[PDB]
Every structure is written in C-alpha cells, then in structure tokens.
Amino acid sequence: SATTFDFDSSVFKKEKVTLSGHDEYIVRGGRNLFPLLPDAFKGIKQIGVIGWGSQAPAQAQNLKDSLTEAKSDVVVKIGLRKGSNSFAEARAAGFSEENGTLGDMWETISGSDLVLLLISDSAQADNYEKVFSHMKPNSILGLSHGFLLGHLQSLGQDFPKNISVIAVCPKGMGPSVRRLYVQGKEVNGAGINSSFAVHQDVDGRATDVALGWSIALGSPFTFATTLEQEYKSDIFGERGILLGAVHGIVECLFRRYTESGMSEDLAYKNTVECITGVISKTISTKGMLALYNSLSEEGKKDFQAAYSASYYPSMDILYECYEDVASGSEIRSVVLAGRRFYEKEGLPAFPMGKIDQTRMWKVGEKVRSVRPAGDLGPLYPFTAGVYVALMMAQIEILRKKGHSYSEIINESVIEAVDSLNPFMHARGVSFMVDNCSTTARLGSRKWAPRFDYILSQQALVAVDNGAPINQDLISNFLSDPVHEAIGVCAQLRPSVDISVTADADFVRPELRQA
Amino acid sequence: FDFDSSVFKKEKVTLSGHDEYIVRGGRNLFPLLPDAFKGIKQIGVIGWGSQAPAQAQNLKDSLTEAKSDVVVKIGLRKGSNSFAEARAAGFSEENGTLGDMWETISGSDLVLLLISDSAQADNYEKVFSHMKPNSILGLSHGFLLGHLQSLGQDFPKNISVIAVCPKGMGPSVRRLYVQGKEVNGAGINSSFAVHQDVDGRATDVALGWSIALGSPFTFATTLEQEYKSDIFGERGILLGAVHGIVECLFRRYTESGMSEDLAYKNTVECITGVISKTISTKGMLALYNSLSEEGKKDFQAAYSASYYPSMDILYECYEDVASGSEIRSVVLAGRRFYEKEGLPAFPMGKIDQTRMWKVGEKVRSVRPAGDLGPLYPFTAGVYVALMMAQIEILRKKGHSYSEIINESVIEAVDSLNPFMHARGVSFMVDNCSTTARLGSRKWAPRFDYILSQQALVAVDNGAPINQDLISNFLSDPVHEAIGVCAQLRPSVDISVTADADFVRPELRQA
Numbered sequence A: 001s002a003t004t005f006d007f008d009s010s011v012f013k014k015e016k017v018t019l020s021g022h023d024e025y026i027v028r029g030g031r032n033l034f035p036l037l038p039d040a041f042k043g044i045k046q047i048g049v050i051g052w053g054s055q056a057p058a059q060a061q062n063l064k065d066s067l068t069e070a071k072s073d074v075v076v077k078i079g080l081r082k083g084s085n086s087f088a089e090a091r092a093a094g095f096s097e098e099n100g101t102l103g104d105m106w107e108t109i110s111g112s113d114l115v116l117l118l119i120s121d122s123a124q125a126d127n128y129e130k131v132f133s134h135m136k137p138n139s140i141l142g143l144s145h146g147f148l149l150g151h152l153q154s155l156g157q158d159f160p161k162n163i164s165v166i167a168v169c170p171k172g173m174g175p176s177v178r179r180l181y182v183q184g185k186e187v188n189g190a191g192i193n194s195s196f197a198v199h200q201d202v203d204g205r206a207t208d209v210a211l212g213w214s215i216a217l218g219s220p221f222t223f224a225t226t227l228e229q230e231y232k233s234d235i236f237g238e239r240g241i242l243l244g245a246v247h248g249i250v251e252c253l254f255r256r257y258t259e260s261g262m263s264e265d266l267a268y269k270n271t272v273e274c275i276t277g278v279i280s281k282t283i284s285t286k287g288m289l290a291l292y293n294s295l296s297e298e299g300k301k302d303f304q305a306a307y308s309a310s311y312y313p314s315m316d317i318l319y320e321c322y323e324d325v326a327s328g329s330e331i332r333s334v335v336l337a338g339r340r341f342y343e344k345e346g347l348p349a350f351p352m353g354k355i356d357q358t359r360m361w362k363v364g365e366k367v368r369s370v371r372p373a374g375d376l377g378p379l380y381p382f383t384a385g386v387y388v389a390l391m392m393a394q395i396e397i398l399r400k401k402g403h404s405y406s407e408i409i410n411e412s413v414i415e416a417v418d419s420l421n422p423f424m425h426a427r428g429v430s431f432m433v434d435n436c437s438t439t440a441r442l443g444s445r446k447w448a449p450r451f452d453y454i455l456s457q458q459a460l461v462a463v464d465n466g467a468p469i470n471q472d473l474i475s476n477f478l479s480d481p482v483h484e485a486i487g488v489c490a491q492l493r494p495s496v497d498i499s500v501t502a503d504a505d506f507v508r509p510e511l512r513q514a
Numbered sequence B: 001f002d003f004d005s006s007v008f009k010k011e012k013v014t015l016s017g018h019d020e021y022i023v024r025g026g027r028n029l030f031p032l033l034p035d036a037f038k039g040i041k042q043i044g045v046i047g048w049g050s051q052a053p054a055q056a057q058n059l060k061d062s063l064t065e066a067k068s069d070v071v072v073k074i075g076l077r078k079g080s081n082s083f084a085e086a087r088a089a090g091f092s093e094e095n096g097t098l099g100d101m102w103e104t105i106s107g108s109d110l111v112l113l114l115i116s117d118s119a120q121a122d123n124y125e126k127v128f129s130h131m132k133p134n135s136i137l138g139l140s141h142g143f144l145l146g147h148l149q150s151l152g153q154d155f156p157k158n159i160s161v162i163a164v165c166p167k168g169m170g171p172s173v174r175r176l177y178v179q180g181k182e183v184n185g186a187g188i189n190s191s192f193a194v195h196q197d198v199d200g201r202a203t204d205v206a207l208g209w210s211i212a213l214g215s216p217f218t219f220a221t222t223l224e225q226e227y228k229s230d231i232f233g234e235r236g237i238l239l240g241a242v243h244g245i246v247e248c249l250f251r252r253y254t255e256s257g258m259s260e261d262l263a264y265k266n267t268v269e270c271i272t273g274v275i276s277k278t279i280s281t282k283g284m285l286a287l288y289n290s291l292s293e294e295g296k297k298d299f300q301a302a303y304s305a306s307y308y309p310s311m312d313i314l315y316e317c318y319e320d321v322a323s324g325s326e327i328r329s330v331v332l333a334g335r336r337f338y339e340k341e342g343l344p345a346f347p348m349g350k351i352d353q354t355r356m357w358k359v360g361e362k363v364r365s366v367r368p369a370g371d372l373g374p375l376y377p378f379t380a381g382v383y384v385a386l387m388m389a390q391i392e393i394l395r396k397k398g399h400s401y402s403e404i405i406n407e408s409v410i411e412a413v414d415s416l417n418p419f420m421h422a423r424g425v426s427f428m429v430d431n432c433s434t435t436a437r438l439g440s441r442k443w444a445p446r447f448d449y450i451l452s453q454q455a456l457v458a459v460d461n462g463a464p465i466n467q468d469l470i471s472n473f474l475s476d477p478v479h480e481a482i483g484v485c486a487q488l489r490p491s492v493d494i495s496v497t498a499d500a501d502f503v504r505p506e507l508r509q510a
C-alpha cells in the first residue's frame, strides 16, 4: 500500500515537507494565491454547493469571498432539498434567488460544473442515485468526506464513469473554517488545513480543481489522501480524540475528582478548562514535549501515572473503533441512524438529543459566567497525562493502520487544538460536538461513553491499586518521531488563533445563544 | 416455524390472541430420548465456555436416567486448559468422553458447536469439513448464520442444522436442572430451530436435546429470529441496559445525598431482589400495584421520562444486530484478543472494580440471608420502562411473544439477576458468552449516558407525565401473556451464592 500521495499541479506550487523521514507534498495557502483561482477552475461556470449544515455555510462563503477577490465570474449557488428550513440562513449569508445563487438542490446539481455534496453522509448514502442522475456528463462531484465511497463499497458499487470525483476535506469544524478565514482577511489569509483526493478524473482538471477549492477555503496547507484513507481516519478520529474520547475523558475525570473531594468548580477547571486552554495552546504552537516540560518535577510523576494507566485502555477502544470504521460496520450504523430521525415501522422518530444538560456542563456554565477573558486554565498534571496518552494512542493506531503523518497529525493533534477545543472552552461540549457533522455528532455520542467506562474500569482502577508506571510508555512518548513532524507542520500554521466566544453567530442556528 | 414431532407432545399456548405451539418439558419425558435421538450414538460437545459444561452434564444426566447408550464426548482444541476442568466434570479420555476437537466432530452424530461465536465465524470451514454426511450440527445461537449471510454463504447441503438456545446463562442451566432432580425437573426455557433437515430426524433431535437440558418449555423460532432477538437482548435489558441503569441511578442518588450503601441497595439490590421476585411470579402490573400512591407517582415520573430514551438505544442496537454491523464487530473483537498487525492483544478487562461495585461488596458482606433489598419506586419505573420499551421494539420488529417474553422478562428475573444479587455485575455478565460480555460492555455505557442526558434531565426539568404512555403500560397485552408463560414455570427458584462452583472457573471464589 502507499502511505504518501504525490500529485501534479500546473497552477499551484507544490512543496515538499519531510515528516519523520517521509517526504510528503503539500500546497501552502494564502490570499495572495486567489488570482490563480480562475486558472484552477477552468471549465467551471457554476459551483453548486448542496446543503447548509456545518460545512456548506462556511465553504460557500469562503469560496464566494475568494472568487470575489480573484475577480472571478464563477457563480456559487446553494441548492437545498424541498423540505429545508435553511433558505433564510443562506439568504442571510448573501445567497439568494434574486442573484441566482439559491435554489432547489436537484436543479442546482443539474446546472453545476462542480457539485459540492455537503449534505449529511446518511443522506448521501440514501440519495446518491438521484445525485448521479442529475450530474452533467463530464462535470465534477466534490465531497468533503470519503463516507460515500465506503457506502458504495458495501453495495459493490462505485461512482458513474462519466464524472470526475474529488474531495477537499477541512480538518476542522465548518464554523472554524469560516471564522479563521474571516480573521485571515486582515493578514494574508487563515483557515483550516485540508486533505484532498482525486478518486476519478475524466479530463485532467481534477487535481487543480481540488487544489483551487482548498486554497479558496483558506487552507494553510493542503495534503493528498484517498477517499478511503480519509473516511477511515476521519470517522475514527471524531469518535476518538477530537470529540468522543475527549468528552469521555472529561466526564470520567470530573467524576473522579469530585468524588475525591475536589470542588465542582475546580474539577471543571482541572478537566475542561485545562484541556481546552493551556494544553491546547501549548500543543498548538510548541508541542506535547514542551507541554510535558512545563510541568514541575512532581507534576511529571502525576502525568506519568495517568499516561501509563491510560495508554492501553484508550488504545483498546480506538483499535475497536478504527476496525469498525474500516469494516463497514460503523458506516452502516450511521446510515441506519439517519433513517431513525423519522418515523417508520410504527415506531417513533429519534432525533439526536442534548448532551450538555448534565451535572458537569451545568457546573461549566457557572464557571464561565464569572470567568474573566483571557483565562488560560490550569495545567493539572493528571489530566494532561490522560489526554496526551489518548492522543498518542490514536497516533499509534493510525500509524499501524497505514496513514500518512500529515493525515495523522491533523486528525489527532492540529484539529483538536486549532479548531475544536476553542469551542468547548467557549461554551462547553455541545458547542464543540454539535457544530460538527451528523456523522461526527452520532459518533461522539456512541463512543464517548466507551472511553469514560474503560478509563474508569481499567485506568483509574490501576492508579488506585498502585500499578507500577510503565516507564517504557513514557520513554516512547518522549522519543516519539511524531513530535518533530508536529513541529514541521506548525511552521505552516498562520499566526492567527481562532477567536470564538459563547455568543458567536457563525455557528449552527440551533446553537446560537446570547 | 411450524413443526411436527413424532416423539413429543406439542401444545398450544395463546399469548395476546396469538396461538403458538410449544413442547413442555419434564424429567418424565426422559424415557423418550432414545426415540428422539434416532441415529445418534455420540454427541460431540465442542467447547468448554459457559454453555458446554452445563449442557454436557445435563445431557449425560438425562441420558443416564433414560438408560441410553448415547455417549456425550467433549471436544477441545490443541493444548486447551479446559481438559482439567472437563475431567473434573466427569469427562475423561480413558472413558472416551473427552478428546480432540476435530476428532470429536468427525465421530459425532450430533455436534454441539459451543465455542465462542467469533471463533465459529473464523473456523466454520474446518468444522464443516469434519462433519459426516447426514450428521447434525447443533448451535445454541444463530450467530453463525448471520455471519455466513454476510458472506453470501450457507451451511453445507449434506448435513442437518438445528439449534437449541437456552434463554439463560449456562451456569443457570446446570444449577436449575440439579435443583429440579427430585421435583420432576427444573431448568431454563429454550427456543429451538431447524434450519436444514436431511432425513426428518432434525426436529426430534432438537426437542430431545432441549428436554434433556431441562427446558420447562421449548418454543419454536428460526436461526435468524434467534440471533436478532438474542444479540440485541443481552445488550438490552438482560445485561447492558440493566448495568447502565444501575450505574446512572447510583450516581444520581448519591449526587442527591443518598449514602452509597442506600444508593446501591436502591438500585442493584432493589432490581435483582424484590423487583425480580415480583416480576418472576406475579408480573410487572403486580409490582406497580403494590406501590403506595406516592410510590406510583414516583414510578410514573421515572417511567414517563425513561421510556423513549431507552427505546432510542434499543432501536439502534436492534438495527445494528439485524444489519450485520454488530455481528461483524464481534468477529473482529475476537481477533483483537490476540496480537496482530504490530499491535497489542486486548482481552476483556474487569467491569466490577469501580466505585459502586466496591460498595456492593461491602453491602453484601453484612447482608442477612433471604434479603431481597428495598423496593425503591423510582428505580422500578426506570427498569420497567426499559423492559416495556424492549418488548415494544421486538413487537414492532416482528418477534413472537414467547421469544419476546423470554428475551425481555423471564431470563432477566429467573436466570440473570440472581447472579448479580449474589455477587455483582461481573458474576452475571461474565458468566454469559463472549458475545454477550462484549455486548454488555459496548452498550451499558450508551444506556447510562442517554438516561443521564435525557431521562433524568427531563425529571429535573419537571417534564409532565405522559399519561397515554402510563395508560398503555397498564393495559398492555404483554402482562396477561407473561402470566400465561408463568403457569409453565416450575416452582423452583435458582439458588446461587458468591461461592458457587458451577460458574466459569475464572469466576469461582471463596
């Protein structure tokens, strides 16, 4: 198999980055590159953005803003299903019928040269035939996730032969893709790193169309992957460290700390504030080694106890999750879950419920109500040990399963600290989880409890039984080749940190609060 | 599955206007075994997990009473550690009742494949190749068919395939049978299926097998209906859901100021004791009716808030089981028990070393004999609500009442709960199959989280009581059906203590 993926661009400058001795080719972003968009989008008069979930709002606005700066005539039109209640939001964002930029999803698909299929993954699974039948012959279908390929594989099917199929997948939530891009207007751009794939190419334009799309989104750097590598790492990652695992970790630790006498206020600060504050900030620009080195000598011992006890139990669940994603089990569960959002078989509809109305999140609201701006959070050693052990276990699973370092680092490190965690610091777990896709929201709900239980049952029990510290795990962490690679990727990161607060209006409508 | 028996008496039972045919058990039927087991000189019991020890002994005991010459031979792989255990149960090489797995399969007329479901999935070809033409393969779970279906495959067309699935843990199959020796029998109800029948012997061989296990009544099903209801049930009310419930309620009660002793009593002791005893012989309605007027209101608040969130998870679980997702996950999980791909081995860990279980050890250390715990109304409401939601899911998914009632009610109260009352969640969960153990671990957390996030939050928010829901619980036809099934239940309650010697070797304590 191939771990790395090279490509050719006649429009953009390809650059090499060496990660742990592995050369990987990438394309750096920047607003200065916007003038190249017309060349990248040759043969494209209309880009049809289908859906208005978490990705579409952001991608559509970023694309339009970029094309406007490039003085391009390419039309970005939003296509929505008939029963959609998102038309008003699209108009608020500047897409409307009077400009010819908002309409029916099928009619939009039919008139598009590039179709960005940004509807729920389960919807793609149950509606691809109609999407295919409406595509113009020789046009381009773009995905932001490889999920549909996994679903087609389960049916022994593939995409039509007469269209190109590409993907540009932002390694961060839609609200962050938009917000960072907006903050980037003051400098030479900002955004969320993206992976791209060229599954099918029927005319030779696929690579540059994908790269142009990514650059237009504001991606600081774009790296190559395949649809399969993307869905395997992605469906897994959100269930792992990005959403599911971090949620399970904070629930498990908050409970342990409060059981042990720590006040609810302090337990919240020592879990959520710690992880979303100092831990993320340090890992974002300095790395995990700098984080460990910022602990006191006694703190390193507590970190070691937590890391040593948490590493394998975390890996157990991650390993399970990854295999369920690769086998097709998880993809099928997501497809069936989407159908259960509606009544059928004489049974009720079961839309996703709220995940932040419980004890620790109610405490979180109180902590934040009186939290001053600029609070960095405490660096509680035990919490850092559990969190970093899970991050390292995820990295190891992805390496052993065959993913590139650019994919591994974005999916297990960069995304958590530069995109997601800032939302949980701002307004709790829901503000983070629920601003992600339906697939990610379902995944977080399904797997967070698994991480909570295994850490409580195994890791914490080991610590309370005086288990010896597995110093080999600690040494492995300290000498891990991923650290240098994380540093290399960090040099590609714009000097703009996402600014998001609780009353942010650039999030899903249902998540807006004031 | 309509069946006809030449040897046994088929009887009708009417459950909510639905006529189902079953076969009543009893030690008095043992003399009929030789006729039932036509063409069977050797029964090869493959494996020595939770079912095999129980089934092998019950079969041998029944055959002896029938004065049958059929040999029950245990077949184990390579250098298995179960040989010593099998010998301790009376099976030996010198008597030809213990031997190599493959050799045992080859010489057997009825092969009981009682090895882990994931192992069946990864080794069925080897099993099939050792089967004699026109021999019979017996399964105690339909999992293997589900796996073959995922491969677009089926069993060989030269053998019969049947199933006798005890609706209770293996240790309970043995224990109840032993307790039933002087009262014309006792046991665990079982479902049976005939997937393939080469010569017409299949039905009676399955029924004989079930009757010999001590089944109070045996009901008909198919391999697919069995795996769909079974893999789901263990993740549901039987193990996963009950575990999630007690964890979530113990946390709520202690958060509210209840002492740990009382929180454990009001959850685990309550459910496994008085609640189970009431449902076992009187029913859910009787349980509700025994509550004071204040108790009924608390019960209603818990039921009204817990019903749908519980159904949400049950619905998801069922569909993952029917689609093939869960079966595939179990097969892959079995492989991760060993090192591969440069990654560590991850055998299942312990689930009873956390806070509430340590409290339970303390609670049981001073528990007087015959103590069945307190009847805590709120706990009853959550538990019964989930029980009723599971029943509804199975109804809407097309299952028969005999199967629904056993998988959602009877097994919980007569087979499983007594073990948790005896020694905690592990004594119950870990005495079940590898598939059930994995399922409980995967789904218990889901029930805990949804009840915490939705049900309990609704109670704290003052959600109004869903009157129609409560009304439907009180008038639900399943209650009368449960009563009918209870009439077939022997007046024998399973006797299990912490030092039980009929459990898995690894679980035997002092």
Ligand SMILES: NC1NC[NH2+]c2c1ncn2[C@@H]1O[C@H](COP(=O)(O)OP(=O)(O)OC[C@H]2O[C@@H](O)[C@H](O)[C@@H]2O)[C@@H](O)[C@H]1OP(=O)(O)O
Residues within 6 Å of the ligand: B047, B048, B049, B050, B051, B052, B076, B077, B080, B081, B082, B113, B114, B115, B116, B117, B119, B123, B140, B141, B143, B170, B432, B433, B434, B435
């Ligand atoms: N690869 C394999 N090849 C052959 N056998 C085998 C393999 N892996 C596990 N096994 C055996 O499987 C047994 C452990 O499995 P288990 O899961 O505890 O087995 P049980 O609970 O007894 O369940 C048996 C059947 O009854 C139904 O209730 C179940 O759904 C299943 O269909 C052990 O005897 C073990 O062998 P020992 O450890 O005893 O040697």
Ligand SMILES: N[C@H]1NC[NH2+]c2c1ncn2[C@@H]1O[C@H](COP(=O)(O)OP(=O)(O)OC[C@H]2O[C@@H](O)[C@H](O)[C@@H]2O)[C@@H](O)[C@H]1OP(=O)(O)O
Residues within 6 Å of the ligand: A051, A052, A053, A054, A055, A056, A080, A081, A083, A084, A085, A086, A105, A117, A118, A119, A120, A121, A123, A127, A144, A145, A147, A174, A436, A437, A438, A439
């Ligand atoms: N049956 C359907 N037919 C068409 N569209 C559709 C259907 N079901 C959900 N949808 C749409 O799907 C959107 C909600 O989905 P979502 O899951 O929040 O969607 P996102 O987070 O935006 O993700 C889109 C893609 O980017 C990747 O990051 C994802 O993995 C996915 O491949 C809404 O716009 C919704 O329509 P509206 O509610 O806006 O009308």
Ligand SMILES: CC[C@@](C)(O)[C@@H](O)C(=O)O
Residues within 6 Å of the ligand: A054, A170, A171, A172, A173, A174, A234, A237, A238, A242, A243, A415, A435, A436, A437, A438, A439, A440
């Ligand atoms: C954490 C998950 C995200 C934001 O990267 C994306 O994959 C999604 O599904 O929404």
Ligand SMILES: CC[C@@](C)(O)[C@@H](O)C(=O)O
Residues within 6 Å of the ligand: B050, B166, B167, B168, B169, B170, B230, B233, B234, B238, B239, B411, B431, B432, B433, B434, B435, B436
């Ligand atoms: C609860 C599950 C049992 C005991 O009925 C059986 O199916 C098993 O898998 O062990």
Ligand SMILES: [Mn+2]
Residues within 6 Å of the ligand: A170, A171, A172, A234, A237, A238
């Ligand atoms: Mn992602």
Ligand SMILES: [Mn+2]
Residues within 6 Å of the ligand: A145, A234, A235, A238, A437, A439, A440
């Ligand atoms: Mn995703």
Ligand SMILES: [Mn+2]
Residues within 6 Å of the ligand: B166, B167, B168, B230, B233, B234
């Ligand atoms: Mn069962």
Ligand SMILES: [Mn+2]
Residues within 6 Å of the ligand: B141, B230, B231, B234, B433, B435, B436
């Ligand atoms: Mn089972």
